[PDB]
Design a protein around this ligand. Structure first.
Ligand SMILES: CC[C@H](CO)NC(=O)Nc1ccc(Cl)cc1
Length: 284
């Protein structure tokens, strides 16, 4: 029975290797990675792979791995798929731990924009969790952490992390992770999956998918929001993505908003992540 080697980049940046039967569905690999991680609250997570065009795709746990990765390497990342609007409601500390690790990457990468003060506050909770109580013996007036806090590091940001770190004496890792998440969950781009698109007039926009609904970023002063409730139906055809917006009370007919995606695969990918978010956040 022939087995394919799988390599998974974990959220701590290390590599898990395992084997699965070559006709295995994605769930099989996902279950192995989750067991390795001691993760029971698996519903928020998934594996990604890079397609022939270098786009990130979610591995569908219901479909054969080989029919998704196709001609590519059996190389994956472990990621947060559904960012919980209220991490305090998660049943386990280890779930919140992996959620923190994902968010740290979202921040360092620039995917999750963040004010100077919030970068320093998030950094201080990471340091408290990882190193425990502030120690001057480690940190001098010229200290620079091994920890990556932001897309661009400044001495001012390193200093502010240390100042806030001093204030967290006695805080345990679970406590510091909860405080991290209480701050992170309020950021305007928390758990927003951005897709490049054009409106019906050809103007370049971003479509954001998240817990609350579908976001349209256009002029930066014109941000349209469609709560999952107001979204009646989602469709794709060729390079186009369509959402049907329910009529206001007393309106006879739904409105259709059409978008142009870069290609047919980008349209399909957007449609699938919308359906998945809509189902997930309709059961939450
Ligand atoms: C690559 C991940 C690094 C190194 O292991 N760990 C880390 O940053 N952990 C963490 C983050 C935030 C909080 Cl609050 C608590 C712990």
């Amino acid at each position: 029975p022939k087995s394919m080697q799988c390599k998974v980049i974990l959220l701590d940046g290390s590599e898990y290797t395992c084997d699965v039967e070559k006709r295995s569905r994605g769930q099989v690999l996902f279950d192995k990675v989750c067991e390795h991680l001691n993760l029971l609250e698996k519903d928020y997570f998934g594996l990604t792979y890079r397609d022939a065009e270098n786009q990130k795709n979610w591995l569908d746990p219901a479909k054969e791995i080989k029919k998704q990765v196709r001609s590519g390497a059996w190389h994956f990342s472990f990621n947060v798929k559904f960012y919980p609007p209220d991490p305090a409601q998660l049943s386990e500390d280890i779930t919140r731990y992996y959620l923190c690790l994902q968010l740290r990457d979202d921040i360092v990468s620039g995917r999750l924009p963040c004010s100077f003060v919030t970068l320093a506050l998030l950094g201080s909770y990471t340091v408290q969790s990882e190193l425990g109580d502030y120690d001057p013996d480690e940190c001098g007036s010229d200290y620079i952490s091994e920890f990556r806090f932001a897309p661009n590091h400044t001495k001012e940001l390193e200093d502010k992390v240390i100042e806030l770190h001093k204030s967290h004496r006695g805080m345990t890792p679970a406590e510091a992770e909860m405080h991290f998440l209480e701050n992170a969950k309020k950021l305007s781009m928390y758990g927003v999956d951005l897709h490049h698109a054009k409106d019906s007039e050809g103007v370049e926009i971003m479509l954001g998918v998240c817990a609350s609904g579908l976001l349209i970023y256009r002029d930066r002063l014109r941000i349209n929001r469609f709560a999952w409730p107001k979204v009646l139906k989602i469709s794709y055809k060729r390079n186009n993505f369509y959402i049907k917006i329910r009529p206001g009370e007393f309106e006879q007919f739904e409105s259709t908003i059409g978008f142009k995606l870069p290609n047919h695969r980008a349209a399909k990918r957007l449609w699938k992540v919308c359906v998945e978010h809509h189902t997930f956040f309709r059961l939450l």
